[model samples]
Target: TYTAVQKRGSVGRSIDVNRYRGYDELRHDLARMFGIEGQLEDPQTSDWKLVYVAHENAILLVGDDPWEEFVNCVQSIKILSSAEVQQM
Candidate 1:
C-alpha cells in the first residue's frame, strides 16, 4: 500500500512499479518555474507524453526515472575522474 501525493490531491492504488515509472509532473512544474521545456504525461496514469527534464538535454533525462534510482546504474554510479568533472 502506497500513496501518491500531489498539490491538487492524491490517491492510492496497488503498488505497480510501471505506474510510477515514466512520469514526472514535479519536474515539469520545476521546468515551468524556470520557463523551459517540461515533460508531460497523463495526469492520472503512466502514459507518457513529453518525458524528459530541465532543458531537455541530459542523457540522464529519459522517459523513466528508474535510471536515476537504480542502485547499480553506471551512468550515475561510476566515479567521476577529476578531468571528467572539469570538462563540464
Candidate 2:
C-alpha cells in the first residue's frame, strides 16, 4: 500500500497499488476519489497528471513504467494539475 498525497488536501489517503491491474483502473479510482472525473481519462489531453515517487527517490510519471515495477517500487502517489506538473 502507498500513500496518495494530493496538492488539494492536507491529509493523504492510503491505496493498495496491488489492487489495480493497470493505469486505467488506477486513474479511474483516483479521479473518483478526488472528484475529478473525466480529467484523467487521457493523459495527452488531460488537465491533471498522475505521478508516483519511488521507494525513496525519483518522481516519475505513473503509466510510463511497467506495472510490476511500479507496484514494487512506488512509495507514494501524487495528483497534480498539468500546469504544475509541467514545471517539475
Candidate 3:
C-alpha cells in the first residue's frame, strides 16, 4: 500500500552529485563507454588535453606534436572567429 503522493511520484531512486576530479571523471566515463571498471587511462602520459585530444582525433594521422598543433590551431580558430567564444 502507498499514499496518493507516493503513487504519482517517481519510484524509489537516488542520484549522486559531486565535483569530480580529473581521474575520477575519466574512470566513470570509461566504465559507461566500455562496460568495464577501474582507471580509464595512464595519468602520466594522458594528463589533461594531451591524451584527450589524441583520443578524440585518433581518426586522423598525427604525431603528438602535430596533434597538439592541430588542436592549437582549431581552438584558436574557434575563439579567433567568435567574440563570445573568446570571452569564455
Clashes of each: 0, 0, 0
> Top model by TM-score, which number?
2
Candidate 2 deviant stretches above 4 angstroms? 9-11
Give the per-residue lDDT digits (tens) of candidate 1, residues 1-88: 3222111122211222233332364435433433333323233342222222232334243335453442122121111223544555
Q: Looking at model 3, report the run of 10 residues with the lowest lDDT sum.
A: 1-10
Write down the TM-score of every candidate.
Answer: 0.22, 0.83, 0.22
Ten contiguous residues with the weakest lDDT in model 1 = 5-14
lDDT, candidate 1, residue 15?
23
For residues 1-88, what per-residue lDDT tens digits would candidate 3 score against the true structure?
1111111122421112122233346335543443333423433333212122224434221123443353342211100112332443
lDDT of each: 0.31, 0.79, 0.28
Q: What ranking of all candidate models by lDDT puts the best one first? A: 2, 1, 3
- Output the TM-score of candidate 2: 0.83
Q: Which lDDT tens digits does candidate 2 get at residues 1-88?
A: 4566575553567888788888899888887877778888788878777888875588888888888988878888888876776676
